[PDB]
Design an enzyme around this catalytic site. Structure first.
Site, mmCIF file in Angstrom:
data_model
loop_
_atom_site.group_PDB
_atom_site.id
_atom_site.type_symbol
_atom_site.label_atom_id
_atom_site.label_comp_id
_atom_site.label_asym_id
_atom_site.label_seq_id
_atom_site.Cartn_x
_atom_site.Cartn_y
_atom_site.Cartn_z
ATOM 1 N N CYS A 141 0.928 -1.452 -0.033
ATOM 2 C CA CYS A 141 -0.253 -0.115 -0.223
ATOM 3 C C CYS A 141 0.728 1.935 -0.192
ATOM 4 C CB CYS A 141 -0.919 0.116 1.180
ATOM 5 S SG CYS A 141 -1.776 -1.490 1.423
ATOM 6 N N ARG A 181 -8.901 -3.233 -2.125
ATOM 7 C CA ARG A 181 -7.887 -1.897 -2.814
ATOM 8 C C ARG A 181 -9.338 -1.842 -3.776
ATOM 9 N NH1 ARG A 181 -3.303 -2.198 -1.411
ATOM 10 N NH2 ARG A 181 -2.020 -3.967 -0.869
#
Lengths: 214, 214
Positions: free
Chosen positions: A45, A120
């Site tokens: 991330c 995501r």
């Protein structure tokens, strides 16, 4: 939530203060791209946040605002941006939502089966506040923002011009960066076609399949 | 629907005959990519079928089977496929579902607000019948099968090696083709982690961000 749907009216706590979505982008005449991420101080991330900030102005110049979101709080956000400042020498200058309680996440399907954090997710939302595209990736595979770019660019051109972008545009295997024009029909409309087919823009593989240089 | 969830048990009408999903592929050890598209005899969509068929073997070597979907009929599909063969010289040999009336399509959120045909939806589902990723791209913007390829690769290497995949892997600006490790929960943990640096494999930015070549 479903494509073509209005992005719901919603206040969010963020790294830049408090805003009404979509209002705050829409009042400005701006598109936004809302993207989620499971957890601050997670390696994949962090590479995403890196790569978003290095494309930031490529989205802004198209008049699209990236805005981030996760179930952590703004002080974890602020620390993580600081960490990415101290460590990768990149400065996060897009807003990041702190979605207390996966309230908005659950409103927008961002939570995988049996979890309480988000995968995501990506929502491309336009200046009418309409959900134009929706991507859900899992925690283990990170995104490729360049596709989102490609996507948003194609979205802008087709909106702006009333054209459809072929597969893998601008590097399509049949016709490259050429774009595809809508169906002839009427009768006058067909005159305009075959007139323009005399070299001539528009080529066609068939009546239902014509395209041109932008 | 939502990532992590099991793919509904459903029987579909296709160009390869009637089949049951997820079953028809789980019992083979295979994943499948299901992807909707709006309309047979449409230009964008013909580029995508062309593009999928040209990578059908990249997907097959990985144990992933493509399968298409639209709200059209089998006989409708069978004429388009032949149009693809006679006009673009490529023979479509992946099954394409005739989802009479949109039954399945509506189950999986493939239909836009106020529509009666599917948008450009993609579903990846694995040997264990689980949806690992979902995309909904808009009618007017074609997909890109090298992103879905990258992602399936990443999904496979994630299931097999236990790792996570950074932004744009195997082209990560920061750390190239390398993968990310976790905190795998034990104490054999920390020794093996630092005593694997010990230049090199594994390397880190901080305790929580370590990664390695494959």
């Amino acid at each position: 939530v479903v494509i073509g749907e209005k992005f719901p009216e919603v206040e969010v706590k963020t790294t830049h203060g408090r805003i009404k979505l979509p209002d705050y982008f829409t009042k400005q005449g701006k598109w936004f791209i809302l993207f989620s991420h499971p957890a601050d101080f997670t390696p994949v991330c962090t590479t995403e946040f890196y790569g978003m900030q290095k494309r930031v102005e490529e989205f802004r110049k198209l008049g699209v605002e990236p805005i981030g979101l996760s179930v952590d709080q703004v002080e974890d956000h602020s620390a993580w941006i600081e960490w990415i400042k101290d460590n990768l020498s990149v400065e996060i200058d897009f807003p990041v939502i702190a979605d207390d309680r996966g309230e908005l996440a659950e409103k927008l399907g961002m939570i995988p089966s049996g979890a309480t954090i988000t995968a995501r997710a990506v929502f491309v939302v336009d200046d009418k506040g309409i959900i134009r595209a929706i991507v859900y990736y899992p925690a283990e595979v990170g995104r490729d923002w360049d596709e989102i770019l490609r996507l948003v660019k194609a979205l802008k051109i087709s909106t702006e011009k009333g054209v459809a972008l072929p597969h893998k545009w601008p590097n399509n295997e049949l016709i490259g960066d050429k774009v595809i024009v809508p169906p002839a029909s009427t009768i006058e409309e067909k005159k305009q076609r075959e007139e323009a087919k005399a070299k001539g823009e528009i080529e066609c593989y068939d009546s239902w399949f014509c395209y041109k240089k932008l």
